[PDB]
Amino acid sequence: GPGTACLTKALKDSGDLLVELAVIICAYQNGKDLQEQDFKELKELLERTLERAGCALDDIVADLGLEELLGSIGVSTGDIIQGLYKLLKELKIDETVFNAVCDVTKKMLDNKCLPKILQGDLVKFLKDLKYKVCIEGGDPELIIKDLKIILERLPCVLGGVGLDDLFKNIFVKDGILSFEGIAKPLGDLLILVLCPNVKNINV
């Protein structure tokens, strides 16, 4: 159908869409005790994301061919998410990329970042990490400055430690970044968990 063709074209035209859809699918499927407002906003985000890429969700749902039987009025968001994931695989998406995005999303859900995920903010954060933080031969003095506004936009990741307090505990030592004391968990989260994942992602 035209839905699949639109999606197929949108995917090839920008790798960003695959990443954005992976976040939405993985947030829906892995968020814990999701409330109705969460389900409502995830559907909204999916529609905004697909439409901004030029495709209507309805045309895509038509190609999904969910049944559509029988004991409910309307199509559940759960079924659409499940069907979109099925369709993506059928379109032979890069699952190394998908799975890395899903792993990042899971980690972020654990850090109470759902509210910012629902805004669509996660892809910008991934890009910020890829280009400003987890870089080869990056200058620690510059990264330490850049990391500050990056974390300010996504404070859930600080795990309750204040921003200024964190940076009182991040140093340049022997030419490398050093996350000490109360900043050590953030340092490990970035260097050992997120940086390897963002290396797997294409954005």
Domain boundaries, the chain: 1-203
Experimental method of this PDB entry: X-ray
Nearest to 22 by CA among 12, 11, 13: 11
- Helix (H), strand (E), coil (C) string for the chain: CHHHHHHHHHHHHCCHHHHHHHHHHHHHHHCCCCCHHHHHHHHHHHHHHHHHCCCCHHHHHHHHCCCCCCCCCCCCHHHHHHHHHHHHHHCCCCHHHHHHHHHHHHHHHHCCCHHHHHCCCHHHHHHHHHHHHCCCCCCHHHHHHHHHHHHHHCHHHHCCCCHHHHHCCEEEECCEEEECHHHHHHHHHHHHHHHHHHHHCCC
Q: What is the resolution of this structure in A?
A: 1.8
